[PDB]
Amino acid sequence: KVKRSRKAPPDGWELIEPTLDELDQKMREAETEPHEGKRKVESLWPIFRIHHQKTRYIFDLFYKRKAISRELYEYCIKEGYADKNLIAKWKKQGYENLCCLRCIQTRDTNFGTNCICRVPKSKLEVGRIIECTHCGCR
Amino acid sequence: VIRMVEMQKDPMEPPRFKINKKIPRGPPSPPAPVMHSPSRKMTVKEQQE
Known part of the structure:
Protein backbone atom coordinates (compact mmCIF):
# COMPACT_ATOMS: atom_id res chain seq x y z
CA LYS A 1 0.00 0.00 0.00
CA VAL A 2 1.08 3.58 -0.69
CA LYS A 3 1.99 5.57 2.42
CA ARG A 4 0.55 8.71 0.71
CA SER A 5 3.04 11.06 2.40
CA ARG A 6 6.54 10.29 0.96
CA LYS A 7 8.04 12.13 3.92
CA ALA A 8 10.67 9.65 5.30
CA PRO A 9 9.00 8.00 8.35
CA PRO A 10 11.24 7.84 11.44
CA ASP A 11 12.71 5.00 13.49
CA GLY A 12 10.43 2.36 14.93
CA TRP A 13 8.37 2.11 11.74
CA GLU A 14 10.54 -0.80 10.59
CA LEU A 15 9.93 -2.49 13.95
CA ILE A 16 6.17 -2.28 13.33
CA GLU A 17 6.42 -2.87 9.56
CA PRO A 18 5.49 -6.59 9.17
CA THR A 19 2.93 -6.47 12.00
CA LEU A 20 0.90 -3.69 10.39
CA ASP A 21 1.37 -5.33 6.98
CA GLU A 22 -0.23 -8.56 8.21
CA LEU A 23 -3.22 -6.63 9.58
CA ASP A 24 -3.54 -4.63 6.35
CA GLN A 25 -3.42 -7.80 4.25
CA LYS A 26 -6.15 -9.31 6.43
CA MET A 27 -8.47 -6.34 5.89
CA ARG A 28 -7.84 -6.30 2.13
CA GLU A 29 -8.69 -10.00 1.96
CA ALA A 30 -11.80 -9.33 4.05
CA GLU A 31 -12.79 -6.48 1.72
CA THR A 32 -12.50 -8.87 -1.25
CA GLU A 33 -14.84 -11.36 0.42
CA PRO A 34 -18.15 -11.85 -1.43
CA HIS A 35 -21.59 -10.97 -0.11
CA GLU A 36 -22.62 -14.63 0.22
CA GLY A 37 -23.07 -16.03 3.72
CA LYS A 38 -23.53 -12.66 5.40
CA ARG A 39 -27.19 -11.85 5.97
CA LYS A 40 -27.51 -8.06 5.75
CA VAL A 41 -24.80 -6.34 7.82
CA GLU A 42 -22.60 -9.30 8.75
CA SER A 43 -20.26 -8.49 5.85
CA LEU A 44 -19.28 -5.21 7.51
CA TRP A 45 -18.42 -7.09 10.72
CA PRO A 46 -14.88 -8.19 9.65
CA ILE A 47 -14.31 -4.63 8.40
CA PHE A 48 -14.67 -3.27 11.93
CA ARG A 49 -13.00 -6.33 13.47
CA ILE A 50 -9.81 -5.78 11.47
CA HIS A 51 -10.07 -2.06 12.26
CA HIS A 52 -10.48 -2.77 15.98
CA GLN A 53 -7.35 -4.94 16.03
CA LYS A 54 -5.39 -2.33 14.07
CA THR A 55 -6.22 0.39 16.60
CA ARG A 56 -5.43 -1.92 19.53
CA TYR A 57 -1.92 -2.60 18.22
CA ILE A 58 -0.94 1.08 18.03
CA PHE A 59 -2.57 1.97 21.36
CA ASP A 60 -0.83 -0.88 23.19
CA LEU A 61 2.51 0.13 21.67
CA PHE A 62 1.98 3.76 22.78
CA TYR A 63 0.12 3.55 26.11
CA LYS A 64 0.53 -0.01 27.43
CA ARG A 65 4.02 -1.02 26.30
CA LYS A 66 5.12 2.59 25.50
CA ALA A 67 7.81 1.31 23.12
CA ILE A 68 6.94 3.34 20.01
CA SER A 69 8.06 6.95 19.78
CA ARG A 70 5.62 9.86 19.67
CA GLU A 71 6.93 10.93 16.26
CA LEU A 72 6.16 7.48 14.86
CA TYR A 73 2.84 7.56 16.71
CA GLU A 74 1.79 10.80 15.01
CA TYR A 75 2.96 9.47 11.64
CA CYS A 76 0.90 6.31 12.12
CA ILE A 77 -2.27 8.22 13.00
CA LYS A 78 -1.78 10.50 9.99
CA GLU A 79 -1.09 7.69 7.50
CA GLY A 80 -4.22 5.81 8.56
CA TYR A 81 -2.91 2.99 10.75
CA ALA A 82 -5.40 3.82 13.52
CA ASP A 83 -8.27 6.26 13.92
CA LYS A 84 -7.72 9.18 16.28
CA ASN A 85 -11.33 9.05 17.50
CA LEU A 86 -11.00 5.37 18.45
CA ILE A 87 -7.91 6.09 20.55
CA ALA A 88 -9.69 9.04 22.15
CA LYS A 89 -12.62 6.93 23.36
CA TRP A 90 -10.25 4.33 24.82
CA LYS A 91 -8.43 6.99 26.86
CA LYS A 92 -11.48 7.40 29.10
CA GLN A 93 -11.95 4.95 31.96
CA GLY A 94 -15.61 4.42 31.08
CA TYR A 95 -14.79 2.76 27.75
CA GLU A 96 -11.68 0.61 27.28
CA ASN A 97 -12.95 -2.37 25.23
CA LEU A 98 -15.61 -0.73 23.08
CA CYS A 99 -16.76 -2.63 20.00
CA CYS A 100 -17.12 0.19 17.46
CA LEU A 101 -17.37 3.97 17.38
CA ARG A 102 -20.77 3.71 15.68
CA CYS A 103 -22.19 1.98 18.77
CA ILE A 104 -21.21 4.92 21.02
CA GLN A 105 -23.26 7.40 18.97
CA THR A 106 -26.35 8.52 20.88
CA ARG A 107 -28.30 9.58 17.78
CA ASP A 108 -27.91 6.22 16.01
CA THR A 109 -30.59 4.33 17.95
CA ASN A 110 -34.25 4.95 17.19
CA PHE A 111 -35.13 4.91 20.90
CA GLY A 112 -32.25 7.30 21.66
CA THR A 113 -29.89 5.13 23.71
CA ASN A 114 -26.73 3.06 23.45
CA CYS A 115 -26.31 -0.41 21.95
CA ILE A 116 -25.87 -3.84 23.51
CA CYS A 117 -22.13 -3.65 22.81
CA ARG A 118 -21.64 -1.02 25.53
CA VAL A 119 -23.40 -3.02 28.25
CA PRO A 120 -21.93 -5.54 30.72
CA LYS A 121 -23.26 -9.08 30.94
CA SER A 122 -23.84 -8.98 34.70
CA LYS A 123 -26.12 -5.95 34.40
CA LEU A 124 -27.90 -7.44 31.37
CA GLU A 125 -30.52 -10.18 31.21
CA VAL A 126 -29.84 -13.84 31.95
CA GLY A 127 -30.72 -15.45 28.63
CA ARG A 128 -29.15 -13.29 25.92
CA ILE A 129 -26.70 -14.39 23.23
CA ILE A 130 -27.37 -11.23 21.22
CA GLU A 131 -24.71 -9.43 19.19
CA CYS A 132 -24.61 -5.79 18.11
CA THR A 133 -25.76 -5.43 14.51
CA HIS A 134 -24.19 -1.99 14.03
CA CYS A 135 -20.97 -2.56 15.99
CA GLY A 136 -20.31 -6.25 15.35
CA CYS A 137 -19.88 -7.89 18.76
CA ARG A 138 -20.25 -7.19 22.48
CA VAL B 1 -46.68 3.75 30.31
CA ARG B 16 -44.31 5.82 0.97
CA PHE B 17 -47.81 5.96 -0.53
CA LYS B 18 -49.87 7.72 -3.20
CA ILE B 19 -52.32 10.59 -2.69
CA ASN B 20 -54.52 9.66 0.27
CA LYS B 21 -58.13 9.02 -0.79
CA LYS B 22 -59.40 8.71 2.79
CA ILE B 23 -62.12 10.90 4.32
CA PRO B 24 -60.52 13.23 6.91
CA ARG B 25 -63.65 14.60 8.60
CA GLY B 26 -67.43 14.41 8.76
CA PRO B 27 -69.70 15.99 6.14
CA PRO B 28 -72.33 16.78 8.80
CA SER B 29 -71.97 20.21 10.42
CA PRO B 30 -73.32 21.96 13.55
CA PRO B 31 -76.23 23.70 11.75
CA ALA B 32 -76.71 26.76 13.96
CA PRO B 33 -80.14 28.37 13.52
CA VAL B 34 -80.69 31.87 12.18
CA MET B 35 -83.13 33.45 14.71
CA HIS B 36 -82.68 36.83 12.99
CA SER B 37 -86.21 38.14 12.42
CA PRO B 38 -89.76 36.75 12.02
CA SER B 39 -90.44 36.61 8.28
CA ARG B 40 -93.95 37.81 7.43
CA LYS B 41 -95.91 39.36 4.59
CA MET B 42 -95.29 43.02 3.83
CA THR B 43 -98.65 44.39 2.63
CA VAL B 44 -101.45 43.71 0.16
CA LYS B 45 -99.83 46.26 -2.17
CA GLU B 46 -96.44 44.52 -1.90
CA GLN B 47 -97.25 42.48 -5.01
CA GLN B 48 -98.05 45.70 -6.90
CA GLU B 49 -95.13 47.76 -5.57
Whole structure:
Protein backbone atom coordinates (compact mmCIF):
# COMPACT_ATOMS: atom_id res chain seq x y z
CA LYS A 1 0.00 0.00 0.00
CA VAL A 2 1.08 3.58 -0.69
CA LYS A 3 1.99 5.57 2.42
CA ARG A 4 0.55 8.71 0.71
CA SER A 5 3.04 11.06 2.40
CA ARG A 6 6.54 10.29 0.96
CA LYS A 7 8.04 12.13 3.92
CA ALA A 8 10.67 9.65 5.30
CA PRO A 9 9.00 8.00 8.35
CA PRO A 10 11.24 7.84 11.44
CA ASP A 11 12.71 5.00 13.49
CA GLY A 12 10.43 2.36 14.93
CA TRP A 13 8.37 2.11 11.74
CA GLU A 14 10.54 -0.80 10.59
CA LEU A 15 9.93 -2.49 13.95
CA ILE A 16 6.17 -2.28 13.33
CA GLU A 17 6.42 -2.87 9.56
CA PRO A 18 5.49 -6.59 9.17
CA THR A 19 2.93 -6.47 12.00
CA LEU A 20 0.90 -3.69 10.39
CA ASP A 21 1.37 -5.33 6.98
CA GLU A 22 -0.23 -8.56 8.21
CA LEU A 23 -3.22 -6.63 9.58
CA ASP A 24 -3.54 -4.63 6.35
CA GLN A 25 -3.42 -7.80 4.25
CA LYS A 26 -6.15 -9.31 6.43
CA MET A 27 -8.47 -6.34 5.89
CA ARG A 28 -7.84 -6.30 2.13
CA GLU A 29 -8.69 -10.00 1.96
CA ALA A 30 -11.80 -9.33 4.05
CA GLU A 31 -12.79 -6.48 1.72
CA THR A 32 -12.50 -8.87 -1.25
CA GLU A 33 -14.84 -11.36 0.42
CA PRO A 34 -18.15 -11.85 -1.43
CA HIS A 35 -21.59 -10.97 -0.11
CA GLU A 36 -22.62 -14.63 0.22
CA GLY A 37 -23.07 -16.03 3.72
CA LYS A 38 -23.53 -12.66 5.40
CA ARG A 39 -27.19 -11.85 5.97
CA LYS A 40 -27.51 -8.06 5.75
CA VAL A 41 -24.80 -6.34 7.82
CA GLU A 42 -22.60 -9.30 8.75
CA SER A 43 -20.26 -8.49 5.85
CA LEU A 44 -19.28 -5.21 7.51
CA TRP A 45 -18.42 -7.09 10.72
CA PRO A 46 -14.88 -8.19 9.65
CA ILE A 47 -14.31 -4.63 8.40
CA PHE A 48 -14.67 -3.27 11.93
CA ARG A 49 -13.00 -6.33 13.47
CA ILE A 50 -9.81 -5.78 11.47
CA HIS A 51 -10.07 -2.06 12.26
CA HIS A 52 -10.48 -2.77 15.98
CA GLN A 53 -7.35 -4.94 16.03
CA LYS A 54 -5.39 -2.33 14.07
CA THR A 55 -6.22 0.39 16.60
CA ARG A 56 -5.43 -1.92 19.53
CA TYR A 57 -1.92 -2.60 18.22
CA ILE A 58 -0.94 1.08 18.03
CA PHE A 59 -2.57 1.97 21.36
CA ASP A 60 -0.83 -0.88 23.19
CA LEU A 61 2.51 0.13 21.67
CA PHE A 62 1.98 3.76 22.78
CA TYR A 63 0.12 3.55 26.11
CA LYS A 64 0.53 -0.01 27.43
CA ARG A 65 4.02 -1.02 26.30
CA LYS A 66 5.12 2.59 25.50
CA ALA A 67 7.81 1.31 23.12
CA ILE A 68 6.94 3.34 20.01
CA SER A 69 8.06 6.95 19.78
CA ARG A 70 5.62 9.86 19.67
CA GLU A 71 6.93 10.93 16.26
CA LEU A 72 6.16 7.48 14.86
CA TYR A 73 2.84 7.56 16.71
CA GLU A 74 1.79 10.80 15.01
CA TYR A 75 2.96 9.47 11.64
CA CYS A 76 0.90 6.31 12.12
CA ILE A 77 -2.27 8.22 13.00
CA LYS A 78 -1.78 10.50 9.99
CA GLU A 79 -1.09 7.69 7.50
CA GLY A 80 -4.22 5.81 8.56
CA TYR A 81 -2.91 2.99 10.75
CA ALA A 82 -5.40 3.82 13.52
CA ASP A 83 -8.27 6.26 13.92
CA LYS A 84 -7.72 9.18 16.28
CA ASN A 85 -11.33 9.05 17.50
CA LEU A 86 -11.00 5.37 18.45
CA ILE A 87 -7.91 6.09 20.55
CA ALA A 88 -9.69 9.04 22.15
CA LYS A 89 -12.62 6.93 23.36
CA TRP A 90 -10.25 4.33 24.82
CA LYS A 91 -8.43 6.99 26.86
CA LYS A 92 -11.48 7.40 29.10
CA GLN A 93 -11.95 4.95 31.96
CA GLY A 94 -15.61 4.42 31.08
CA TYR A 95 -14.79 2.76 27.75
CA GLU A 96 -11.68 0.61 27.28
CA ASN A 97 -12.95 -2.37 25.23
CA LEU A 98 -15.61 -0.73 23.08
CA CYS A 99 -16.76 -2.63 20.00
CA CYS A 100 -17.12 0.19 17.46
CA LEU A 101 -17.37 3.97 17.38
CA ARG A 102 -20.77 3.71 15.68
CA CYS A 103 -22.19 1.98 18.77
CA ILE A 104 -21.21 4.92 21.02
CA GLN A 105 -23.26 7.40 18.97
CA THR A 106 -26.35 8.52 20.88
CA ARG A 107 -28.30 9.58 17.78
CA ASP A 108 -27.91 6.22 16.01
CA THR A 109 -30.59 4.33 17.95
CA ASN A 110 -34.25 4.95 17.19
CA PHE A 111 -35.13 4.91 20.90
CA GLY A 112 -32.25 7.30 21.66
CA THR A 113 -29.89 5.13 23.71
CA ASN A 114 -26.73 3.06 23.45
CA CYS A 115 -26.31 -0.41 21.95
CA ILE A 116 -25.87 -3.84 23.51
CA CYS A 117 -22.13 -3.65 22.81
CA ARG A 118 -21.64 -1.02 25.53
CA VAL A 119 -23.40 -3.02 28.25
CA PRO A 120 -21.93 -5.54 30.72
CA LYS A 121 -23.26 -9.08 30.94
CA SER A 122 -23.84 -8.98 34.70
CA LYS A 123 -26.12 -5.95 34.40
CA LEU A 124 -27.90 -7.44 31.37
CA GLU A 125 -30.52 -10.18 31.21
CA VAL A 126 -29.84 -13.84 31.95
CA GLY A 127 -30.72 -15.45 28.63
CA ARG A 128 -29.15 -13.29 25.92
CA ILE A 129 -26.70 -14.39 23.23
CA ILE A 130 -27.37 -11.23 21.22
CA GLU A 131 -24.71 -9.43 19.19
CA CYS A 132 -24.61 -5.79 18.11
CA THR A 133 -25.76 -5.43 14.51
CA HIS A 134 -24.19 -1.99 14.03
CA CYS A 135 -20.97 -2.56 15.99
CA GLY A 136 -20.31 -6.25 15.35
CA CYS A 137 -19.88 -7.89 18.76
CA ARG A 138 -20.25 -7.19 22.48
CA VAL B 1 -46.68 3.75 30.31
CA ILE B 2 -45.44 3.77 26.70
CA ARG B 3 -42.66 6.09 25.54
CA MET B 4 -43.40 8.06 22.36
CA VAL B 5 -40.10 8.01 20.45
CA GLU B 6 -40.48 9.45 16.95
CA MET B 7 -38.53 7.39 14.43
CA GLN B 8 -36.14 9.59 12.45
CA LYS B 9 -36.90 8.77 8.81
CA ASP B 10 -34.45 9.13 5.94
CA PRO B 11 -34.48 12.75 4.70
CA MET B 12 -34.00 11.65 1.08
CA GLU B 13 -36.77 9.33 -0.15
CA PRO B 14 -39.86 9.11 -2.36
CA PRO B 15 -43.16 9.14 -0.43
CA ARG B 16 -44.31 5.82 0.97
CA PHE B 17 -47.81 5.96 -0.53
CA LYS B 18 -49.87 7.72 -3.20
CA ILE B 19 -52.32 10.59 -2.69
CA ASN B 20 -54.52 9.66 0.27
CA LYS B 21 -58.13 9.02 -0.79
CA LYS B 22 -59.40 8.71 2.79
CA ILE B 23 -62.12 10.90 4.32
CA PRO B 24 -60.52 13.23 6.91
CA ARG B 25 -63.65 14.60 8.60
CA GLY B 26 -67.43 14.41 8.76
CA PRO B 27 -69.70 15.99 6.14
CA PRO B 28 -72.33 16.78 8.80
CA SER B 29 -71.97 20.21 10.42
CA PRO B 30 -73.32 21.96 13.55
CA PRO B 31 -76.23 23.70 11.75
CA ALA B 32 -76.71 26.76 13.96
CA PRO B 33 -80.14 28.37 13.52
CA VAL B 34 -80.69 31.87 12.18
CA MET B 35 -83.13 33.45 14.71
CA HIS B 36 -82.68 36.83 12.99
CA SER B 37 -86.21 38.14 12.42
CA PRO B 38 -89.76 36.75 12.02
CA SER B 39 -90.44 36.61 8.28
CA ARG B 40 -93.95 37.81 7.43
CA LYS B 41 -95.91 39.36 4.59
CA MET B 42 -95.29 43.02 3.83
CA THR B 43 -98.65 44.39 2.63
CA VAL B 44 -101.45 43.71 0.16
CA LYS B 45 -99.83 46.26 -2.17
CA GLU B 46 -96.44 44.52 -1.90
CA GLN B 47 -97.25 42.48 -5.01
CA GLN B 48 -98.05 45.70 -6.90
CA GLU B 49 -95.13 47.76 -5.57
